[PDB]
Amino acid sequence: CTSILYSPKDHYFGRNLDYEIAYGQKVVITPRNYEFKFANLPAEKSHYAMIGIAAVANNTPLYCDAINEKGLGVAGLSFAGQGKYFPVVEDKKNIASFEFISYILATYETVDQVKENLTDVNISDVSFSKELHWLVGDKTGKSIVVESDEKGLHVYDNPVNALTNAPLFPQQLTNLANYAAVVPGQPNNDFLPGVDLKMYSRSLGTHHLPGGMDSESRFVKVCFALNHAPKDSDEVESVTNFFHILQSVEQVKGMDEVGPNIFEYTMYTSCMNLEKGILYFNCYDDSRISAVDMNKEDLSSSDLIVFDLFKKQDISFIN
Amino acid sequence: CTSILYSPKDHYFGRNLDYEIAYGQKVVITPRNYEFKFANLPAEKSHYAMIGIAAVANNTPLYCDAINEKGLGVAGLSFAGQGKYFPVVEDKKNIASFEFISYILATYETVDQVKENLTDVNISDVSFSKELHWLVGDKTGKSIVVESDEKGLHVYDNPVNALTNAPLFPQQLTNLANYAAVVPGQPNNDFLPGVDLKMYSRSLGTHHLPGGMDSESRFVKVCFALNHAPKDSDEVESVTNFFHILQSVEQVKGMDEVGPNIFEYTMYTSCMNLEKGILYFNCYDDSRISAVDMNKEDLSSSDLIVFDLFKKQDISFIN
Amino acid sequence: CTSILYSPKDHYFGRNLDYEIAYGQKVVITPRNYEFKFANLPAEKSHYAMIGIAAVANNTPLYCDAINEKGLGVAGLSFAGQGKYFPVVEDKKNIASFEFISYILATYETVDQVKENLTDVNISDVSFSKNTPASELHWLVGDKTGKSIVVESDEKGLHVYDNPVNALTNAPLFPQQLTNLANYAAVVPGQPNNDFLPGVDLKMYSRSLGTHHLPGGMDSESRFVKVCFALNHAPKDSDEVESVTNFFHILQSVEQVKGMDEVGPNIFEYTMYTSCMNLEKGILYFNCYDDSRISAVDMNKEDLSSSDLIVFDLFKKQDISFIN
Amino acid sequence: CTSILYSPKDHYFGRNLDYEIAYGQKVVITPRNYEFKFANLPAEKSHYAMIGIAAVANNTPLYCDAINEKGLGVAGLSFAGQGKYFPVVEDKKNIASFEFISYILATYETVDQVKENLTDVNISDVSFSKNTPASELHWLVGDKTGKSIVVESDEKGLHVYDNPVNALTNAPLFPQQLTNLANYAAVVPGQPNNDFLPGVDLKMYSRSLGTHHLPGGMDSESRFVKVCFALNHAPKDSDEVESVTNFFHILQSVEQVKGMDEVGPNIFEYTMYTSCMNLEKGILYFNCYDDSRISAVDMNKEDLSSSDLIVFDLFKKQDISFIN
Ligand SMILES: *CC(=O)CC[C@@H](C)[C@H]1CC[C@H]2[C@@H]3CC[C@@H]4C[C@H](OS(=O)(=O)O)CC[C@]4(C)[C@H]3CC[C@]12C
Ligand SMILES: *CC(=O)CC[C@@H](C)[C@H]1CC[C@H]2[C@@H]3CC[C@@H]4C[C@H](OS(=O)(=O)O)CC[C@]4(C)[C@H]3CC[C@]12C
Ligand SMILES: *CC(=O)CC[C@@H](C)[C@H]1CC[C@H]2[C@@H]3CC[C@@H]4C[C@H](OS(=O)(=O)O)CC[C@]4(C)[C@H]3CC[C@]12C
Ligand SMILES: *CC(=O)CC[C@@H](C)[C@H]1CC[C@H]2[C@@H]3CC[C@@H]4C[C@H](OS(=O)(=O)O)CC[C@]4(C)[C@H]3CC[C@]12C
């Protein structure tokens, strides 16, 4: 998976969901008066509204990535082989992994607010019944990474506004330095001084840009694509550029084999305007972008407002 | 640029057009009785119909990539620094570079027919007024590459059904062997036998798959994405997979700097069913796929039938 | 710099030392009765004897890498940007960085012994030289059992990791070095089977295309990956002369030639010397950048009950043998 | 195998020979009056004298690489999969593959002379040994002018390319090797400026991160790229002993250690020897896999007017100098 925070003028928060099987995900809006019930935390009958992609498990939203009305955004990505949850403790505040996105987006407003309030937080091992890390951004253009591993909970400042999967986030930032010579154009020939190299192709400075489907390759490329994306754009141009950024690490069917004839592919791509509260999305089967505006519904309500995420190819026939 | 021939069940032929400035390209259909006039070749008042992307230069179609009704397809890609045209000679048949796509698709039917008839062909230096190589495929699932360089004209068999830019095609096939160890899944640990390597990420066998925007990187990745694409699919699923294949080498704005604050990006993506004569397309600004059916117009006509290629973002609003 | 532990039959400990500054290193044997005076640890008048490469300042052996008479070796490699020393604390067993090799070699016998006794050890910030800037170090420890460990003191304290590849370079932290190894699991010494484009006859134009992505850079991660590959595939079950020859070739595969590693204005880091120490026989083989010929010093050919350092020349001129 | 032309002050021609099969090579001086009998060319009873590495079969020098008394050198490297020999034709100047080094060295003096005289030369398929399978070769030719050329005979005939990097390995064709060099134009020996993610403080955790993508594989393209990097950045304006030391280190950067290049069932291609020939003084420096010490043979210390081959031992045992 690949999540980014993009700030050309407005602020946009979304992710690619690359997996092999769907979970019945849908576009759900959680109004301010939907009563949240947490395992080891007090209930929240009044909170901020939020919109995002979630799997509805009998009137309860299990979010994958969402934003609230206050301009905060959280996205959950797999951390298999690295993350470790811990049994609940009376000392710290215990949030289960599946309610993290819901609790954070319903309570807080900014990344600074989230960073300060996580010092007494323990990600509990409470399952829904029978390993993830998160990316949190806001309207300031900054983001943090929340990872709970063998050494406990960690909150890192994210200088690149992106996140994928394994390994630990400090290791991902270290691997970024391995590509410091990459440039979008042509490099200066300090490789063989005094020798005229045949610059046979444009953009030879990206010849070693990673293009694999593994977590490190997708992290390096999406950091590159996001950093050089256009800026100072209006809404339609910004959301258009956002999708192209995540398309640069698209996982096509057949390229990522996770099991015997089992492939992981980009199931859906979400783009959420942090200011206007609009969720844009397409999927693997539908290239056309759809939009859902959370601020066009009664937020003071108390029932989930669900929309369809996976659609079929909406081809426009000109004949 | 990146052109492919994709044969899941039906046969599909298209390309990415990655450039920095548009040329007023449009979806044009050339009926069977549009009179072609060639520089050093006899005119063709009766020929096969064809549909493709072209820039209309006063009633004359200058094609970038097109297919005919007989299931043949040609696509033109830049060959800068490598190609060389030659002055016209009375010995050989002289085709100018800009009429190559039109002459081939109006005269012949199959790749075998094109390969045999190119033995007495010279690509002339006749400009429209004041360097390209081609990819030719058909319904057999095979393709050839036509390149005219310093050593004359060359017709190569294409075992990978793909093409980009520089260098020469035999050199592109040689560079493919540099990635023979790449697998879509996890490799067997014959790297350090007797050592348990921490397979921290899925698809570590693609860690060295190229992801740059240069011609060699895009050639290696699109060959990989095309070879492992799904097969035995219906029309909608096949065209959907075709676009994802070319998206795997999408050029996002800011990643490919060809000049001072000048960037080359994927302007449009075309997908043409070789059997049904349908052209599918989207562009950088519009993610929704459009379709034009050549067999829904009077082919026995004599006037070009032009449609709009570049559109704006066709967002579907659910609220 | 690159340090390895090689066990074809006997066990060999050694390293390349790649730097741009020399410190007057020499082959230094420390006998069993040279009184070691430690900063915040009791002075040991008698101990194990050791042989290695060291700088001698005020008749004190400051070892870069060495082995003791009992077949245990320790090598010191720079850990700049990651390592961190700590102030002296009363509870912990305080060992200064410059005395780590000397203390470990003189006290303990095996890797398990060393690993069991670093439980309450703190690496102190006490420095020997007050005007020579030096980056923090981390250590590789091996013995005749063929196993090795990595001793690292970073921001979060001291850590001891088991080393499954028996090699070490510089940054980053060792768990990150092992993680980076998985990025090269597809590398093979020969030719891989074409599961890249099944159905296409890829033209294997050259031999050993399975190593086309083997790193060859002068940086820390590149030399770590390649030396792990070269060490794992080196011949085994060899005699003394053949094993020593194979050892120097393993480290030659990651040698740093003058001009390839620029560390300043026309200042280049290069492989200054290469040490190779037989753990079983206590023999130190070595050469340098200027002398390709291999020299040897047997620790057991000297009086180990002595009380003073026995030094020999390390850097030599090129020893060309003129055939006519 | 890797061949280079190194010009720090004097000019040095040499190569690594990486293979799994030995052919009894030795240092062979061919005096000026050893009668050369050529397959389809006139026999030259007197010519230039040469020194190099060769196998002697029936008192015939089959050179792998050599230089002549006038400062011109030629090295033979395998071109398997690309090279093609041709039948003898009456018009063209037919030179067999095994006599190319001997003929060129004995006839001509400079690279320009050689380049001017291959205009009508055809590389014939006449083979010396009828039972020893050998792949087609291509050649690197240099002289005291610091320039070099590449002689390749492929499917489309004979070609002579000017070599701007003064190095050569194996496949593919030389214009493809030069094209592949451009894929590494971003490599620097030090640290690059961060135009990768402008506005982000990338943590340069290690030195020489500009070489993180320098190839280090055993294959033909990897060793060609790295040896071009190592040759271009080697020190210059050096004396005899320093230049020879730098020369062996350049080729050591692409050395093939046993176990890294698998060419069959537990059969490995490794660097068997390394030759280094001073073009100005006619001195051949060399070592081998088993002997790290450098030996030398001066061609001018022997009678060049002689009529018989003067041979010396190439492969030697490890010459360890015992300090005590
Ligand atoms: C690209 C990737 O990294 C793949 C991530 C994918 C498998 C995850 C991402 C979000 C997950 C859902 C989050 C909400 C709940 C959490 C529950 O955790 S449990 O309580 O410990 O069982 C599991 C179900 C569900 C719906 C997650 C399913 C997996 C995800 C879609
Ligand atoms: C991604 C790439 O490789 C970029 C290719 C792009 C610049 C080309 C592809 C097709 C070209 C057009 C083909 C038709 C004519 C040909 C004329 O050639 S000339 O006669 O020699 O001048 C030039 C105009 C035009 C319309 C080409 C323009 C460039 C292309 C779109
Ligand atoms: C490439 C590497 O990782 C090696 C770096 C190289 C420059 C180091 C390795 C061993 C060092 C010496 C160790 C012994 C003493 C330690 C003293 O530390 S102090 O406490 O700060 O004084 C400094 C001097 C010396 C000789 C070290 C010098 C640097 C090293 C050779
Ligand atoms: C790594 C490389 O490219 C080098 C390959 C290596 C095995 C070759 C290089 C030089 C060869 C010898 C050259 C002299 C003769 C030539 C004879 O050719 S024949 O006409 O077919 O008989 C074969 C024998 C010999 C000694 C060559 C052997 C192979 C090489 C050492």
Side-chain angles (χ1 to χ4, degrees), chain A residues 1-25 27-36 38-39 42-43 46-69 71-89 93-114 117-119 121-127 131-150 152-197 199-230 232-249 251-286 288 290-300 302-319, chain B residues 1-25 27-36 38-39 42-43 46-69 71-89 93-114 117-119 121-127 131-150 152-197 199-230 232-249 251-286 288 290-300 302-319, chain C residues 1-25 27-36 38-43 46-89 91 93-115 117-119 121-129 131-146 148-155 157-202 204-235 237-254 256-305 307-316 318-322 324, chain D residues 1-25 27-36 38-43 46-89 91 93-115 117-119 121-129 131-146 148-155 157-202 204-235 237-254 256-305 307-316 318-322 324:
Chain A
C1 281
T2 309
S3 184
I4 56 173
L5 170 64
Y6 179 45
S7 326
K9 163 151 82 193
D10 273 347
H11 298 68
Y12 303 81
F13 185 83
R15 54 93 60 76
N16 274 343
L17 194 123
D18 311 324
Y19 215 51
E20 54 271 356
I21 188 45
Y23 280 103
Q25 291 102 312
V27 170
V28 316
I29 305 162
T30 303
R32 341 207 196 206
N33 287 299
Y34 176 94
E35 187 188 85
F36 279 141
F38 305 111
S46 178
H47 52 68
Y48 301 110
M50 74 197 53
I51 184 182
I53 301 296
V56 189
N58 188 33
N59 231 8
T60 281
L62 290 171
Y63 271 112
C64 300
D65 42 289
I67 72 177
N68 64 17
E69 59 201 337
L72 186 68
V74 187
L77 293 84
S78 150
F79 211 42
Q82 309 296 300
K84 171 175 188 141
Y85 303 146
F86 290 99
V88 316
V89 294
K93 160 139 54 141
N94 303 263
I95 313 171
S97 42
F98 58 91
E99 43 198 22
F100 183 87
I101 291 160
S102 266
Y103 176 84
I104 296 272
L105 280 166
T107 305
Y108 308 107
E109 298 188 280
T110 67
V111 164
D112 280 341
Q113 198 159 21
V114 173
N117 282 119
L118 276 160
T119 59
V121 156
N122 164 79
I123 310 296
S124 71
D125 49 4
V126 176
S127 45
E131 328 206 284
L132 300 156
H133 65 154
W134 297 270
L135 173 70
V136 179
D138 64 15
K139 283 180 295 191
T140 65
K142 278 138 187 44
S143 41
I144 55 170
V145 169
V146 180
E147 303 179 349
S148 165
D149 48 39
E150 239 174 25
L153 181 66
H154 308 285
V155 176
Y156 307 108
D157 284 301
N158 199 338
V160 288
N161 283 354
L163 191 67
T164 53
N165 309 110
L168 299 177
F169 191 66
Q171 307 186 40
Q172 288 270 56
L173 296 185
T174 294
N175 187 71
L176 266 191
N178 286 343
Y179 302 89
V182 168
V183 298
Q186 310 278 48
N188 289 333
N189 181 17
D190 303 291
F191 165 54
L192 299 170
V195 177
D196 294 319
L197 300 173
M199 285 328 229
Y200 67 98
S201 172
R202 256 82 202 211
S203 191
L204 273 171
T206 61
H207 193 264
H208 294 103
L209 188 72
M213 316 277 91
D214 61 290
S215 166
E216 275 190 14
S217 310
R218 289 188 282 103
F219 184 81
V220 177
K221 179 160 200 216
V222 80
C223 283
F224 184 69
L226 173 56
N227 176 281
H228 288 84
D232 297 315
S233 37
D234 282 316
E235 180 77 7
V236 164
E237 168 165 62
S238 294
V239 62
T240 295
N241 281 325
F242 184 99
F243 274 88
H244 282 306
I245 293 165
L246 284 181
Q247 285 185 15
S248 77
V249 287
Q251 297 211 233
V252 184
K253 272 171 191 186
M255 283 178 92
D256 186 351
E257 192 177 20
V258 308
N261 221 39
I262 297 162
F263 305 90
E264 143 173 326
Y265 61 100
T266 298
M267 312 218 281
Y268 72 82
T269 304
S270 55
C271 173
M272 301 175 262
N273 190 311
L274 281 171
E275 288 88 39
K276 309 171 157 31
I278 307 175
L279 188 142
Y280 307 85
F281 69 95
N282 60 3
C283 66
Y284 194 90
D285 303 315
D286 191 19
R288 179 161 146 171
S290 292
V292 173
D293 202 334
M294 144 191 66
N295 296 298
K296 294 214 267 204
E297 314 270 322
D298 173 43
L299 297 189
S300 293
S302 55
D303 287 337
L304 308 173
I305 330 181
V306 181
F307 302 79
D308 271 1
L309 163 69
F310 299 112
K311 320 172 184 303
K312 62 137 181 95
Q313 197 65 274
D314 198 342
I315 302 194
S316 172
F317 300 93
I318 317 291
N319 275 358
Chain B
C1 281
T2 309
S3 184
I4 56 173
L5 170 64
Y6 179 45
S7 326
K9 163 151 82 193
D10 273 347
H11 298 68
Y12 303 81
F13 185 83
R15 54 93 60 76
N16 274 343
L17 194 123
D18 311 324
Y19 215 51
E20 54 271 356
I21 188 45
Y23 280 103
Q25 291 102 312
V27 170
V28 316
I29 305 162
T30 303
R32 341 207 196 206
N33 287 299
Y34 176 94
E35 187 188 85
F36 279 141
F38 305 111
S46 178
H47 52 68
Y48 301 110
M50 74 197 53
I51 184 182
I53 301 296
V56 189
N58 188 33
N59 231 8
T60 281
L62 290 171
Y63 271 112
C64 300
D65 42 289
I67 72 177
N68 64 17
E69 59 201 337
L72 186 68
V74 187
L77 293 84
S78 150
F79 211 42
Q82 309 296 300
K84 171 175 188 141
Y85 303 146
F86 290 99
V88 316
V89 294
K93 160 139 54 141
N94 303 263
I95 313 171
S97 42
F98 58 91
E99 43 198 22
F100 183 87
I101 291 160
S102 266
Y103 176 84
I104 296 272
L105 280 166
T107 305
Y108 308 107
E109 298 188 280
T110 67
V111 164
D112 280 341
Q113 198 159 21
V114 173
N117 282 119
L118 276 160
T119 59
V121 156
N122 164 79
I123 310 296
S124 71
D125 49 4
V126 176
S127 45
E131 328 206 284
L132 300 156
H133 65 154
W134 297 270
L135 173 70
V136 179
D138 64 15
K139 283 180 295 191
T140 65
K142 278 138 187 44
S143 41
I144 55 170
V145 169
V146 180
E147 303 179 349
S148 165
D149 48 39
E150 239 174 25
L153 181 66
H154 308 285
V155 176
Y156 307 108
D157 284 301
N158 199 338
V160 288
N161 283 354
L163 191 67
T164 53
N165 309 110
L168 299 177
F169 191 66
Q171 307 186 40
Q172 288 270 56
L173 296 185
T174 294
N175 187 71
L176 266 191
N178 286 343
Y179 302 89
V182 168
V183 298
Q186 310 278 48
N188 289 333
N189 181 17
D190 303 291
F191 165 54
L192 299 170
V195 177
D196 294 319
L197 299 173
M199 285 328 229
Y200 67 98
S201 172
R202 256 82 202 211
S203 191
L204 273 171
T206 61
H207 193 264
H208 294 103
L209 188 72
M213 316 277 91
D214 61 290
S215 166
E216 275 190 14
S217 310
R218 289 188 282 103
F219 184 81
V220 177
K221 179 160 200 216
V222 80
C223 283
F224 184 69
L226 173 56
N227 176 281
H228 288 84
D232 297 315
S233 37
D234 282 316
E235 180 77 7
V236 164
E237 168 165 62
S238 294
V239 62
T240 295
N241 281 325
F242 184 99
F243 274 88
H244 282 306
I245 293 165
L246 284 181
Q247 285 185 15
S248 77
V249 287
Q251 297 211 233
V252 184
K253 272 171 191 186
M255 283 178 92
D256 186 351
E257 192 177 20
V258 308
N261 221 39
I262 297 162
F263 305 90
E264 143 173 326
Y265 61 100
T266 298
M267 312 218 281
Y268 72 82
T269 304
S270 55
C271 173
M272 301 175 262
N273 190 311
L274 281 171
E275 288 88 39
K276 309 171 157 31
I278 307 175
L279 188 142
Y280 307 85
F281 69 95
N282 60 3
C283 66
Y284 194 90
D285 303 315
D286 191 19
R288 179 161 146 171
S290 292
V292 173
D293 202 334
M294 144 191 66
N295 296 298
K296 294 215 267 204
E297 314 270 322
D298 173 43
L299 297 189
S300 293
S302 55
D303 287 337
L304 308 173
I305 330 181
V306 181
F307 302 79
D308 271 1
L309 163 69
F310 299 112
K311 320 172 184 303
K312 62 137 181 95
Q313 197 65 274
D314 198 342
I315 302 194
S316 172
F317 300 93
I318 317 291
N319 275 358
Chain C
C1 305
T2 321
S3 178
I4 59 167
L5 169 66
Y6 182 35
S7 337
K9 177 156 82 201
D10 267 345
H11 296 61
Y12 303 81
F13 199 82
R15 52 96 53 76
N16 281 342
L17 202 135
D18 320 329
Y19 217 62
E20 83 273 18
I21 303 169
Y23 298 90
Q25 287 96 334
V27 171
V28 175
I29 297 185
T30 302
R32 333 148 173 261
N33 288 312
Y34 172 95
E35 178 172 80
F36 273 134
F38 297 124
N40 302 40
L41 277 200
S46 101
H47 49 63
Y48 298 119
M50 62 213 41
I51 178 177
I53 301 290
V56 182
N58 233 325
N59 213 76
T60 305
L62 304 174
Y63 274 106
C64 311
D65 47 280
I67 67 160
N68 65 10
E69 62 202 279
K70 296 286 148 222
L72 167 155
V74 176
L77 300 88
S78 84
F79 209 32
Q82 321 273 298
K84 173 177 233 193
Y85 303 150
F86 290 103
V88 174
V89 295
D91 50 73
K93 194 176 171 158
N94 303 269
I95 307 182
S97 89
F98 62 92
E99 54 198 18
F100 185 85
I101 295 185
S102 323
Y103 181 73
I104 290 306
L105 285 210
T107 312
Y108 313 105
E109 230 178 1
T110 55
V111 168
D112 273 317
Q113 203 172 15
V114 168
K115 183 160 39 154
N117 288 141
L118 300 137
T119 323
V121 164
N122 155 73
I123 301 285
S124 64
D125 51 15
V126 166
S127 88
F128 180 96
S129 167
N131 325 112
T132 290
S135 34
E136 300 80 354
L137 323 178
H138 66 167
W139 294 269
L140 171 68
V141 187
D143 59 12
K144 289 185 301 232
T145 74
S148 73
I149 51 151
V150 176
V151 182
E152 274 173 13
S153 164
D154 51 61
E155 219 194 19
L158 187 69
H159 299 88
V160 177
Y161 316 102
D162 277 297
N163 191 344
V165 284
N166 290 315
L168 196 62
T169 52
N170 309 110
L173 317 164
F174 194 60
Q176 327 192 204
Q177 290 274 46
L178 296 182
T179 295
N180 193 56
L181 275 185
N183 293 341
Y184 300 90
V187 175
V188 295
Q191 315 274 40
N193 295 313
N194 178 23
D195 298 290
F196 168 51
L197 303 164
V200 193
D201 298 310
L202 295 173
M204 306 314 266
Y205 65 94
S206 157
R207 278 165 166 195
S208 192
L209 277 161
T211 62
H212 187 263
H213 295 290
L214 195 62
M218 300 304 105
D219 58 296
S220 176
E221 274 186 10
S222 294
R223 304 185 271 101
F224 179 80
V225 174
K226 184 167 183 172
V227 86
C228 283
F229 187 70
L231 177 55
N232 175 282
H233 286 88
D237 303 330
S238 36
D239 282 329
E240 184 72 10
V241 197
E242 161 158 44
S243 317
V244 172
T245 296
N246 283 330
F247 185 98
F248 277 85
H249 273 130
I250 295 165
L251 291 178
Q252 262 181 37
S253 76
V254 288
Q256 296 206 229
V257 188
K258 268 168 206 184
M260 299 183 69
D261 187 347
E262 176 156 1
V263 302
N266 217 59
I267 299 177
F268 302 97
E269 154 177 324
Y270 64 97
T271 298
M272 300 199 314
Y273 73 81
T274 300
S275 56
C276 171
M277 297 179 275
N278 188 319
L279 289 172
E280 268 93 350
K281 321 266 212 63
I283 300 166
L284 191 136
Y285 309 85
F286 66 91
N287 57 18
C288 63
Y289 196 91
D290 292 325
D291 185 18
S292 150
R293 190 190 183 178
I294 297 160
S295 301
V297 160
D298 196 327
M299 173 194 33
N300 302 111
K301 284 197 184 314
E302 304 281 327
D303 176 34
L304 293 193
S305 292
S307 211
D308 304 295
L309 313 171
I310 322 181
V311 312
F312 301 87
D313 268 351
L314 171 58
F315 306 106
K316 309 172 154 194
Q318 188 73 267
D319 199 343
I320 303 187
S321 150
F322 298 87
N324 59 5
Chain D
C1 305
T2 321
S3 178
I4 59 167
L5 169 66
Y6 182 35
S7 337
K9 177 156 82 201
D10 267 345
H11 296 61
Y12 303 81
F13 199 82
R15 52 96 53 76
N16 281 342
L17 202 135
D18 320 329
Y19 217 62
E20 83 273 18
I21 303 169
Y23 298 90
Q25 287 96 334
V27 171
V28 175
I29 297 185
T30 302
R32 333 148 173 261
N33 288 312
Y34 172 95
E35 178 172 80
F36 273 134
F38 297 124
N40 302 40
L41 277 200
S46 101
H47 49 63
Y48 298 119
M50 62 213 41
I51 178 177
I53 301 290
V56 182
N58 233 325
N59 213 76
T60 305
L62 304 174
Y63 274 106
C64 311
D65 47 280
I67 67 160
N68 65 10
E69 62 202 279
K70 296 286 148 222
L72 167 155
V74 176
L77 300 88
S78 84
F79 209 32
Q82 321 273 298
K84 173 177 233 193
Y85 303 150
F86 290 103
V88 174
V89 295
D91 50 73
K93 194 176 171 158
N94 303 269
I95 307 182
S97 89
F98 62 92
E99 54 198 18
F100 185 85
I101 295 185
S102 323
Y103 181 73
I104 290 306
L105 285 210
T107 312
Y108 312 105
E109 230 178 1
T110 55
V111 168
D112 273 317
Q113 203 172 15
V114 168
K115 183 160 39 154
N117 288 141
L118 300 137
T119 323
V121 164
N122 155 73
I123 301 285
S124 64
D125 51 15
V126 166
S127 88
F128 180 96
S129 167
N131 325 112
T132 290
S135 34
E136 300 80 354
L137 323 178
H138 66 167
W139 294 269
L140 171 68
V141 187
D143 59 12
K144 289 185 301 232
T145 74
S148 73
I149 51 151
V150 176
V151 182
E152 274 173 13
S153 164
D154 51 61
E155 219 194 19
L158 187 69
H159 299 88
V160 177
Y161 315 102
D162 277 297
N163 191 344
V165 284
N166 290 315
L168 196 62
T169 52
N170 309 110
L173 317 164
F174 194 60
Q176 327 192 204
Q177 290 274 46
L178 296 182
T179 295
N180 193 56
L181 275 185
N183 293 341
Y184 300 90
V187 175
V188 295
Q191 315 274 40
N193 295 313
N194 178 23
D195 298 290
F196 168 51
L197 303 164
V200 193
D201 298 310
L202 295 173
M204 306 314 266
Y205 65 94
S206 157
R207 278 165 166 195
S208 192
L209 277 161
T211 62
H212 187 263
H213 295 290
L214 195 62
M218 300 304 105
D219 58 296
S220 176
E221 274 186 10
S222 294
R223 304 185 271 101
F224 179 80
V225 174
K226 184 167 183 172
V227 86
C228 283
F229 187 70
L231 177 55
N232 175 282
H233 286 88
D237 303 330
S238 36
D239 282 329
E240 184 72 10
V241 197
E242 161 158 44
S243 317
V244 172
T245 296
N246 283 330
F247 185 98
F248 277 85
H249 273 130
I250 295 165
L251 291 178
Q252 262 181 37
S253 76
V254 288
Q256 296 206 229
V257 188
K258 268 168 206 184
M260 299 183 69
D261 187 347
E262 176 156 1
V263 302
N266 217 59
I267 299 177
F268 302 97
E269 154 177 324
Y270 64 97
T271 298
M272 300 199 314
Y273 73 81
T274 300
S275 56
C276 171
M277 297 179 275
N278 188 319
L279 289 172
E280 268 93 350
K281 321 266 212 63
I283 300 166
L284 191 136
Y285 309 85
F286 66 91
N287 57 18
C288 63
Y289 196 91
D290 292 325
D291 185 18
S292 150
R293 190 190 183 178
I294 297 160
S295 301
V297 160
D298 196 327
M299 173 194 33
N300 302 111
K301 284 197 184 314
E302 304 281 327
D303 176 34
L304 293 193
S305 292
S307 211
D308 304 295
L309 313 171
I310 322 181
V311 312
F312 301 87
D313 268 351
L314 171 58
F315 306 106
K316 309 172 154 194
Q318 188 73 267
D319 199 343
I320 303 187
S321 150
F322 298 87
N324 59 5

